[PDB]
Amino acid sequence: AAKIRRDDEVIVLTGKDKGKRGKVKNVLSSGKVIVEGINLVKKHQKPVPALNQPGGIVEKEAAIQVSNVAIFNAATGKADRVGFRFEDGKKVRFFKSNSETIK
Amino acid sequence: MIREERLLKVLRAPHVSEKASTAMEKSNTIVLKVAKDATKAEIKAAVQKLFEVEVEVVNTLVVKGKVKRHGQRIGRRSDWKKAYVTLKEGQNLD
Amino acid sequence: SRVCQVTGKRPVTGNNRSHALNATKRRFLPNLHSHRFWVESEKRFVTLRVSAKGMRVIDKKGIDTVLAELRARGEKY
Amino acid sequence: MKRTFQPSVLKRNRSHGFRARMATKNGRQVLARRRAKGRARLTVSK
Amino acid sequence: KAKELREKSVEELNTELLNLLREQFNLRMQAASGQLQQSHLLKQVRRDVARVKTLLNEKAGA
RNA sequence: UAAGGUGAUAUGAACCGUUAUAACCGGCGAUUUCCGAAUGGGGAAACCCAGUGUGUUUCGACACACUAUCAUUAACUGAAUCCAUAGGUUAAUGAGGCGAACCGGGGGAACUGAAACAUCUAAGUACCCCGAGGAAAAGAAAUCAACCGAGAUUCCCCCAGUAGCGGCGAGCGAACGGGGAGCAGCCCAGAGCCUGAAUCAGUGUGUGUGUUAGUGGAAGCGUCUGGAAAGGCGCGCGAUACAGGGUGACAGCCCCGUACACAAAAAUGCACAUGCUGUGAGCUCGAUGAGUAGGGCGGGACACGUGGUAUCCUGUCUGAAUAUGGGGGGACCAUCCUCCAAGGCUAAAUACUCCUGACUGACCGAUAGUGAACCAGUACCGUGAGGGAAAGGCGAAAAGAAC
RNA sequence: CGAAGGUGUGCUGUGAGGCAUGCUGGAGGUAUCAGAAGUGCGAAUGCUGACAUAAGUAACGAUAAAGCGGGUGAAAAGCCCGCUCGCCGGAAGACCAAGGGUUCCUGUCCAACGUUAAUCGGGGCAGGGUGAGUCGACCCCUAAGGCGAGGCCGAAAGGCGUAGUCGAUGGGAAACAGGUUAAUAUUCCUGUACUUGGUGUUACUGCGAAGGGGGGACGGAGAAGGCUAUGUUGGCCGGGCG
RNA sequence: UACGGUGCUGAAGCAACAAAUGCCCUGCUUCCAGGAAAAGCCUCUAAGCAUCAGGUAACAUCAAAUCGUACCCCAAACCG
Numbered sequence A: 001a002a003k004i005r006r007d008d009e010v011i012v013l014t015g016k017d018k019g020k021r022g023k024v025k026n027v028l029s030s031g032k033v034i035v036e037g038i039n040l041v042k043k044h045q046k047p048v049p050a051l052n053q054p055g056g057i058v059e060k061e062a063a064i065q066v067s068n069v070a071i072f073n074a075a076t077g078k079a080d081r082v083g084f085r086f087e088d089g090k091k092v093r094f095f096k097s098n099s100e101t102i103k
Numbered sequence B: 001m002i003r004e005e006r007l008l009k010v011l012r013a014p015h016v017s018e019k020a021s022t023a024m025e026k027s028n029t030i031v032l033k034v035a036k037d038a039t040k041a042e043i044k045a046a047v048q049k050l051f052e053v054e055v056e057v058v059n060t061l062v063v064k065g066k067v068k069r070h071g072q073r074i075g076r077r078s079d080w081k082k083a084y085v086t087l088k089e090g091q092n093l094d
Numbered sequence C: 001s002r003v004c005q006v007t008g009k010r011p012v013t014g015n016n017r018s019h020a021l022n023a024t025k026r027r028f029l030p031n032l033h034s035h036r037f038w039v040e041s042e043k044r045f046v047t048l049r050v051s052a053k054g055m056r057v058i059d060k061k062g063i064d065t066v067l068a069e070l071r072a073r074g075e076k077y
Numbered sequence D: 001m002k003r004t005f006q007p008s009v010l011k012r013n014r015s016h017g018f019r020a021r022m023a024t025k026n027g028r029q030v031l032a033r034r035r036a037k038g039r040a041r042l043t044v045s046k
Numbered sequence E: 001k002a003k004e005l006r007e008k009s010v011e012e013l014n015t016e017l018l019n020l021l022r023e024q025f026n027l028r029m030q031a032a033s034g035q036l037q038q039s040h041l042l043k044q045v046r047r048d049v050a051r052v053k054t055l056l057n058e059k060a061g062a
Numbered sequence F: 001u002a003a004g005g006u007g008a009u010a011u012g013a014a015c016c017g018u019u020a021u022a023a024c025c026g027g028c029g030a031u032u033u034c035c036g037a038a039u040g041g042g043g044a045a046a047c048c049c050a051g052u053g054u055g056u057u058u059c060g061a062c063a064c065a066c067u068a069u070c071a072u073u074a075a076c077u078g079a080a081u082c083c084a085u086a087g088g089u090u091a092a093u094g095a096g097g098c099g100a101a102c103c104g105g106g107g108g109a110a111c112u113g114a115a116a117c118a119u120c121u122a123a124g125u126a127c128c129c130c131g132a133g134g135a136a137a138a139g140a141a142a143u144c145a146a147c148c149g150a151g152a153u154u155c156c157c158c159c160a161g162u163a164g165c166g167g168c169g170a171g172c173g174a175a176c177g178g179g180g181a182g183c184a185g186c187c188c189a190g191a192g193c194c195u196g197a198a199u200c201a202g203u204g205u206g207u208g209u210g211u212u213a214g215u216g217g218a219a220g221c222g223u224c225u226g227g228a229a230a231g232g233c234g235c236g237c238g239a240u241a242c243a244g245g246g247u248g249a250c251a252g253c254c255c256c257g258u259a260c261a262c263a264a265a266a267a268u269g270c271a272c273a274u275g276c277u278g279u280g281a282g283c284u285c286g287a288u289g290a291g292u293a294g295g296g297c298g299g300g301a302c303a304c305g306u307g308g309u310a311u312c313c314u315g316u317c318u319g320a321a322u323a324u325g326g327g328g329g330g331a332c333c334a335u336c337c338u339c340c341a342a343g344g345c346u347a348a349a350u351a352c353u354c355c356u357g358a359c360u361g362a363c364c365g366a367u368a369g370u371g372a373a374c375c376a377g378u379a380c381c382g383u384g385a386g387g388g389a390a391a392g393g394c395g396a397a398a399a400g401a402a403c
Numbered sequence G: 001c002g003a004a005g006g007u008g009u010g011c012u013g014u015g016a017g018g019c020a021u022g023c024u025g026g027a028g029g030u031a032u033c034a035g036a037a038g039u040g041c042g043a044a045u046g047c048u049g050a051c052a053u054a055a056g057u058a059a060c061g062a063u064a065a066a067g068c069g070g071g072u073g074a075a076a077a078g079c080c081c082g083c084u085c086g087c088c089g090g091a092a093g094a095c096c097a098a099g100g101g102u103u104c105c106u107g108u109c110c111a112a113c114g115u116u117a118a119u120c121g122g123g124g125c126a127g128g129g130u131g132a133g134u135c136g137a138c139c140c141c142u143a144a145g146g147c148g149a150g151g152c153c154g155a156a157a158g159g160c161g162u163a164g165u166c167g168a169u170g171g172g173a174a175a176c177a178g179g180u181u182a183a184u185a186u187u188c189c190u191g192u193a194c195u196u197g198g199u200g201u202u203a204c205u206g207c208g209a210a211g212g213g214g215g216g217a218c219g220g221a222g223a224a225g226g227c228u229a230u231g232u233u234g235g236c237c238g239g240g241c242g
Numbered sequence H: 001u002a003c004g005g006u007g008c009u010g011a012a013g014c015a016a017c018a019a020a021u022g023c024c025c026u027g028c029u030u031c032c033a034g035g036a037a038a039a040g041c042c043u044c045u046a047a048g049c050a051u052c053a054g055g056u057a058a059c060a061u062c063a064a065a066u067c068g069u070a071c072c073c074c075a076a077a078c079c080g
């Protein structure tokens, strides 16, 4: 009964990237998602001789709260909250605006 | 006759060591880590079947586990059993 | 154990009271005696550690009545 | 000087060990107190 | 494999159980050295021995 | 139930899964080493050593089952000793051990108070011991009352700090009666007559109601400040949902929930219903609990310390009547009233919380609150019983500082 | 657009106090009028924590003793190697039991630990190491003693004890020499033995116990005699001619 | 020659004397204070067994498990 899932396209509601969009890359068990290309941090990656990493300032994506994102409704061009209904005996997601089934 | 199911659970691992390399080339003796409740007859029956090699004698000893400290928490490794298995002459094993 | 087998008497506890009413705890032992009772039906003697009150009971009820009670109580004799 | 603790494992286990506690009634009450307190080492016995 | 092994006899499960345990031995000596580089096979065989041992107690004595 | 998983420190590795046996949750199962009542014998717990039987053997040996003690019953056996009995051997069933408090019983202090102290008090308290149940205990008048009557037991409020008890000191302290909670009565001491008739127990089934996973669950944007908006200022919207929590600062409308609406393949509680098994129901005529009541002596219990002391219990010695009879009505007697001991059973109101769920607090906020917010009954101390700590907070996010 | 708290300043009240504000702090605080208190600390040889003081003072644990060269190293009085010196030698050497439990060996590290430094260590970290038919235990046997079916006794708990069953510190089969590992050896290897059980043939034929007997099986002191361990000297062999 | 070592080769290997608190000796002598137990081991028969079982004798074969074994141990490792 998770509203935001893996291949979903979301928009960001709060934080330093209020308004940007992206695809969720993975959702974490702690109630966080990593959305592709948004919450960028610059990690000072320490070199390891074994494992062959040269070590640099790697810029990568940090997790963000699921509460901070909503599924982008590409029809209206906005964010919509997600409801659940049963269609053909199968639980599907739909947008709370305009009642259209999320696919 | 030792049952065939138990003989697969007797042997744990070969033990690599400087002493193990010496005993293999001089006295022609392999060094095995065995199960703790395994006796000498169970090891001799297992090596003669699972490795297909002729065992002359098996000497065993129990290795007491060391006491280590991970961080600041004390801990103790497991007691394990060690077997010097002397193969008969001409026999060879990897 | 100081227990009459017939009547079930038992050492109870009380007080020695002095003239100045000083109370020290004492015991009241029952007047137990081991006695061989002739059972006429079974034609043998049965020893019972019995008080003198219980010997008055055996003289009144009869040894057959009392040994019925001791088996119904579940007591060896 | 000769101090008051002269150890002997045989005498340690016959006097304070597990089966010496379980033998008598009061020793069984000792193990019930240590379980109620929640001791890691319930007796002397290794 | 609970559906597949259930459609076997007592002697076939006993044959299969003896073939799993040889594989468990052969993985363990391989993992004793640094040769085994698929660590999940130790868990898969160990789970599959448990499925065979489960069905033997069902078909026999139950 | 699911798109994500392979518990935590704790990354990584190798993998699994994405429409359904990946994982996860619940029900019933399976496995369940060794020690421990430990139960085959032993033992310095987690070890040592067997016996018997049925199986396997590549004859080297393996695997499995059983074997404690006691009680009861049954079978068989069986002395001195003829029968017999004791004893013996099997078999079956049961018990054993643990656990916080509450309960009943067997034992039972002292410090203390008395401004000392011995009677007394503390107090049938602490403690020890035994036994039991979800409650136990008590319980269906040989009870009160006062010439009117009440109608088993237990509990609460009164009566009343009264009447009394007491080195008449310190203290101890009712009952009758009244108001409530709760209410229920029965059976054997025995025969018949009618025969399965009441009720209860056990075991099924069926139905309802729970419990043990779950499902749906409303409605917000703009702008300003700011690292970040849930804040400010606008403008809306939901509400049988403004309980609560989380989200980068304070969110009804972002998230999780909440109100409300539902949901169980399987197991199970409780109700009913009913089947079966066992149990007797009703009527009549009887019968009506003896080493007992009472007494002497010594103690104990009753608020009642032997006092003028009734009543209750019994260690000891005695010892009735027995319904035309007996017990009680606070020495005792008479009259009158009331009741029927020496056989039993019984729900409710009552007591408690190791434990589970939900919620609450003019309760605490890390020297507090549990000893313990943290790998705490740990470290440590002690031969041992036993004693017993200290120690919370980077940030919104490790972006935990490449070079 | 900066709460509590912290730290200043200014002002104000008769006092306990109050108000405003700078800085720090970075998220709570709370008028008024009522209500309730774990409501105010300098003392209790108070309790807990932190920090002073004496004071960079006493001391640095046997008066068996050191000196130098070389090495390693960031650094050497202390480590390693070498040559001298000194000390023990019925121990300050060697082997165990008891007890401890990895302190053993090797690599690596020097923060803490070591009464100084430390490259060193019984310190940290990682790896390695304990091999048995004969050693020891287990086991067979019992002592003192413990437990103890029944039993006897006791308010309960329990006490004592028979048959039994435990319990060594004593009784009971057998392995030595040489070699070897960084670390084990009567355990490994080489050589040469030994003991007790199984089964199996062959010859032989009174076997049989929970019973009977023998043996095991026993003190103190003293006296010699015979030896050996071991030592000294000679011989012998090898080296030496200062 | 990793200066630690490792490999190879190898003479003589006798006698006398002294000599224990060790061994014969669990002896011997002597004294009074009068000096464990049980099994292994040896032997005797009881019921039993009757040409079978068992007994010892030789030979062959098999078995001898399990646990301990490092290190200090008059000490820097044990009790202080």
Ligand SMILES: [Mg+2]
Pocket (backbone or CB within 6 Å): B057
């Ligand atoms: Mg060998």
Ligand SMILES: [Mg+2]
Pocket (backbone or CB within 6 Å): B060, B061
């Ligand atoms: Mg060994």
Ligand SMILES: [Mg+2]
Pocket (backbone or CB within 6 Å): C023
């Ligand atoms: Mg008194």
Ligand SMILES: [Mg+2]
Pocket (backbone or CB within 6 Å): none
């Ligand atoms: Mg992980």
Ligand SMILES: [Mg+2]
Pocket (backbone or CB within 6 Å): none
């Ligand atoms: Mg046992």
Ligand SMILES: [Mg+2]
Pocket (backbone or CB within 6 Å): none
């Ligand atoms: Mg036992």
Ligand SMILES: [Mg+2]
Pocket (backbone or CB within 6 Å): F041, F042
């Ligand atoms: Mg035994």
Ligand SMILES: [Mg+2]
Pocket (backbone or CB within 6 Å): none
């Ligand atoms: Mg007193």
Ligand SMILES: [Mg+2]
Pocket (backbone or CB within 6 Å): F113, F114
């Ligand atoms: Mg007083």
Ligand SMILES: [Mg+2]
Pocket (backbone or CB within 6 Å): none
């Ligand atoms: Mg009751």
Ligand SMILES: [Mg+2]
Pocket (backbone or CB within 6 Å): none
């Ligand atoms: Mg009337």
Ligand SMILES: [Mg+2]
Pocket (backbone or CB within 6 Å): A001
């Ligand atoms: Mg839901």
Ligand SMILES: [Mg+2]
Pocket (backbone or CB within 6 Å): F217
């Ligand atoms: Mg919702």
Ligand SMILES: [Mg+2]
Pocket (backbone or CB within 6 Å): A014, A065, A067, A068, F247, F254
């Ligand atoms: Mg949010």
Ligand SMILES: [Mg+2]
Pocket (backbone or CB within 6 Å): F249, G027
């Ligand atoms: Mg903030």
Ligand SMILES: [Mg+2]
Pocket (backbone or CB within 6 Å): F289
């Ligand atoms: Mg009667």
